Each structure stands twice: as C-alpha cells, then as structure tokens.
Chains A and B, each alone.
With several copies, the nearest count.
Chain A
Amino acid sequence: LHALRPHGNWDYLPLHNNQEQQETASLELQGMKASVDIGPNRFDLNEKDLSLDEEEQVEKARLDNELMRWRRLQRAQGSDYDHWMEAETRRIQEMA
C-alpha cells in the first residue's frame, strides 16, 4: 500500500530537481482543475431539474390544495379571541 499509494508516482515524475524547477507554473494549471475530466461540464444540477410524472403532478397539486385549505382552516383555528387579539395588537405595533 505504501508502494502503490495515491500520488506515489510524483517521486518518479521528475527525473531531476533541476528539470522539475525548469518548468514554470501558470494560471492554466489552476484553471484546468475546475474541469471534470470524464463527465461533461454542466452549469447547474438542482432539485428543480427533477422531471415529474402525471401522478406526481396530480399529487403535488392535491398537496397544494390541501395546504390552501389548511391555511384557510388555521385562519379560523387561530381566530380564538386570545390569539386573534394577540395578532391584532402585533400588527398594530408593526404598522405604528
């Protein structure tokens, strides 16, 4: 494992210290690291790129409608006079 360790060939790459120092590093050597070698370079890959099927779309629309009706029902649940006065005075202090 010590013989075939990663980057163990750097001792043999340069046959001499003078020949190694003769080479001059450039910003191209830094820029080449940002490019993946095997796969093609792509800009972005996020969750929005995940395509949805018909069942997934219908389920997402159903979940959105459920969220809408849940917000509507919470508008009346939190409408208990205590919490309602709380939110009212909070909005008053916000606008003032």
Chain B
Amino acid sequence: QRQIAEYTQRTPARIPWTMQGL
C-alpha cells in the first residue's frame, strides 16, 4: 500500500568520391 502510494540495421559504407568516382 505504501509503495503504491509513493508510486502514484545494415547500411553500406560511403566510399569517398575520390576513390569511387573513377
């Protein structure tokens, strides 16, 4: 009674453009 009273996923990495664009 007293207690109630007190109570109330998988993302791919981004390669840099200097490496992926060529």
Contact = CB atoms under 8 A, between A and B. Distances in A.
Question: Interface SS of chain B: helix, strand, loop or mixed?
Answer: helix
A31 B22 CA distance: 12
B8 interface: no
Nearest to A34: B18
Contacts of A34: 18
Contacts, number: 15
B17 A41 contact: no
Give the size range of A's interface with the partner.
Answer: under 10
B4 interface: no
B19 interface: yes
Interface string A3-42: 0000000000000000000000000100110111100010
B1 to A, nearest CB: 47
A34 B18 CA distance: 7
A1 B22 CA distance: 32
Given A28-B17, A41-B18, 13 more contacts: A31-B17, A31-B18, A32-B18, A32-B22, A34-B18, A35-B18, A35-B19, A35-B21, A35-B22, A36-B22, A37-B22, A41-B19, A41-B22
